Amino acid sequence: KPGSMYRNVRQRSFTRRKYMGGVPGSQVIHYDMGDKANTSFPVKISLIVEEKCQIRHTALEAARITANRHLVADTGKMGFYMKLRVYPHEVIRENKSGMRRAFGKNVGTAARVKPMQKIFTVAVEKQNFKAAKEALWHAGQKLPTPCRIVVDEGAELVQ
Template structure:
């Protein structure tokens, strides 16, 4: 897999690359689910985690944060008392031009300064103030949901902010 540190893929540097048909062997996304809990019910409270800076979030980080939040919500709130959504999708293909290491490597990897590289993973490109995760629940479980999103924020490569919105469902 990737040998370079993840911080190299955090910055939004070049144009997004999503054309998988031109690249052989793009690794699949590690994100398993995008809707968890009870998606059929309407809940009055929405708790959302926003990115404070534009960045790229690797699919591994999204999946780790998703698993963390879902596990906490299942334990503390119960499956029928929330709807948890992952709001971004890792479209952008990450590429790496593998470099030779060891004795004589400086002669081997001399050319091809801006080489295309092989696909090593995918990432979601996130803009400033974009929603990453949302939890829909009742006011009774507001604090537990905020704690779960706070824990997920530590797994993401950008500073995050939690926003609470209360909707009136009585129409």
């Protein structure tokens, strides 16, 4: 289905596993990227959201893939630590008769967000800051909401 079919937040949440049935799995495999064992990156930037919405897991997977490729290509395999944050807990249902017993059935999973809520986070050195911004800008292109980039730690270093 199209992206805008399930993107607005108009109705209550629907997430209790034990009551619904037959929720399909997910594609996102790993939520931590890069050098997990390192903890000495002085710059910590992140991608934030400007509006409430629902993000499908497929969009998150595409954004993660593109950011991974860019960061590994330019910064290096050991020069960063990316970490996705929001996990998809919501469930999406698509009716499939007419309006007779129109209640839908599970077709997917989505992750609700909130304004100014961090989605991604990348830590790098001082020399690979522009590459980090370049990587995080492409990832927000696959995402269903307007997105801005905020440098959380080491702002005085970069700025």
